Amino acid sequence: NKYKRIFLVVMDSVGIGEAPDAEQFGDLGSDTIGHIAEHMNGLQMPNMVKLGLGNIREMKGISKVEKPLGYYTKMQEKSTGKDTMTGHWEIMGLYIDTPFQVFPEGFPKELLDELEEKTGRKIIGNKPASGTEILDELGQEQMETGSLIVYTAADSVLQIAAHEEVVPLDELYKICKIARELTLDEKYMVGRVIARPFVGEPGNFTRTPNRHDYALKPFGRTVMNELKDSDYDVIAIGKISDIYDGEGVTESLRTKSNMDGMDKLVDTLNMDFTGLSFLNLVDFDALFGHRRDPQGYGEALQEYDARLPEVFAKLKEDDLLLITADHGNDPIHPGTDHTREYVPLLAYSPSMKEGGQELPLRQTFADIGATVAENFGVKMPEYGTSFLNEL
């Protein structure tokens, strides 16, 4: 092995400017980091700067440096979709032709009709809403009618809420599995169906810990599958395991926040493993991108950057750190959807004694997967070109 351990960090939605095909997606003008840097009157990310973020692209407060710690470039998405599952699946060696869909005005009548026809239950709600709003609104109606509350959100999800004392948990799960089958349909293709059981009384409804998720498996066997099958460690941190529906994962560490995510990354640096440690930092997307909150997004980026020197201190000569993103989600952009953007790539190891250089632009996210596979001597993915020997 050239590297014993690879630490891959996805800063979820942290895009570095409109992609060549951004017009197809209604994403002309998008620029996640650049618009944030503008809003902040200069982002303070000195450690990402030291790695070479500004060498990729200069932005307010993010300048190029003469001797970046590692190698740097950006990546272009080849898959059709700009959603989380597409980006992550591509990163780990796949190509996804069929995009996952999001439903801001609610789900189509035809899908809901087929769900009614299969379940014998009425559907109410059908709108993007918080777990608090639809419950407050329609929780009482649900209790009195045995109807299902269907709701969505800014991401590719279909949520089914029902009171545990009105619809038994087992029945809610059966219903969600049916919905999961019906949404394996390109017209209605959602990343995840979510059971949202709740208890309580009107004006005091609470969601229970009995949530279950029904995800689609990646459309192909990934570099993670191949690592796991060759007896390497694949440690998933945060949403990573759910994103791949557990495929190729040997250990999964739950996280509650970006800072918690960084703590778990630090924990894996303390572990004697051989293989991949894979972190998703989701707050960027979930709390700030979709809520179009450039200030919160800016602060979160600064909070993340401040954690980095501890990571640098723990990396060994035969460790590689890879930092990237899975799409954009520009918080100064119309609507609530992701943005089709290039993503940054930084590749750093303490063994890089002379610092890094510019890498050729990565023409697919799968170049990461290809690099990982070549490093560990496993079957190369069908998609992606390794940059391992460029390092």
Contacting residues toward Mn ion, per CB under 5 A: 12, 26-27, 84, 155, 185, 267, 285, 326
Q: How far is the CB of 96 from Mn ion (least distance, A)?
A: 14
Q: Which is nearer to Mn ion, 144 or 185 (CB)?
A: 185
The H helix count followed by the E strand count for the chain is 13, 13
Q: How far is the CB of 270 from Mn ion (least distance, A)?
A: 7
Q: Which is nearer to Mn ion, 97 or 201 (CB)?
A: 97
Residue 163, annotated ligand binder?
no
Q: How far is the CB of 158 from Mn ion (least distance, A)?
A: 14
Pull the structure tokens for residue 301. Answer: 């980026």
Residue 20: Cβ within 10 Å count: 10
Cα dist from 37 to 132, 296, 299, 303, whole Å: 33, 12, 10, 14
Residue 39, annotated ligand binder?
no
Pairing of strands 251-253, 233-237: parallel
Pull the structure tokens for residue 338. Answer: 């992701």
Residue 212, annotated ligand binder?
no
Q: Which is nearer to Mn ion, 12 or 283 (CB)?
A: 12
Q: How far is the CB of 358 from Mn ion (least distance, A)?
A: 26
Cα dist from 283 to 208, 272, 279, 300, 339, whole Å: 22, 28, 12, 8, 16
Cα dist from 117 to 103, 110, 123, 177, 309, whole Å: 21, 10, 11, 14, 56
Q: Which is nearer to Mn ion, 89 or 198 (CB)?
A: 89
Distance CA 53, CA 58 (A): 8
Pull the structure tokens for residue 289. Answer: 């991108």
Q: Which is nearer to Mn ion, 27 or 77 (CB)?
A: 27
Q: How far is the CB of 309 from Mn ion (least distance, A)?
A: 15
Tracing tokens 């902040």 back to the chain, one arrives at 40
Q: Which is nearer to Mn ion, 191 or 275 (CB)?
A: 191
Which of 358, 362, 368, 256 is CA-nearest to residue 10?
A: 368
Q: How far is the CB of 181 from Mn ion (least distance, A)?
A: 9
Q: Which is nearer to Mn ion, 42 or 106 (CB)?
A: 106
Tracing tokens 């942290």 back to the chain, one arrives at 14
Count of positions (residues) in the chain: 391
- DSSP E strands in 85-222: the ranges are 123-128, 148-152, 157-163, 192-201, 204-207, 212-215
Residue 327, annotated ligand binder?
yes
Q: How far is the CB of 150 from Mn ion (least distance, A)?
A: 17
> Which single residue brings its beta carbon nearest to Mn ion?
84
Binding residue positions for Mn(2+): 12, 285, 290, 326-327, 338
Binding residue positions: 12, 285, 290, 326-327, 338
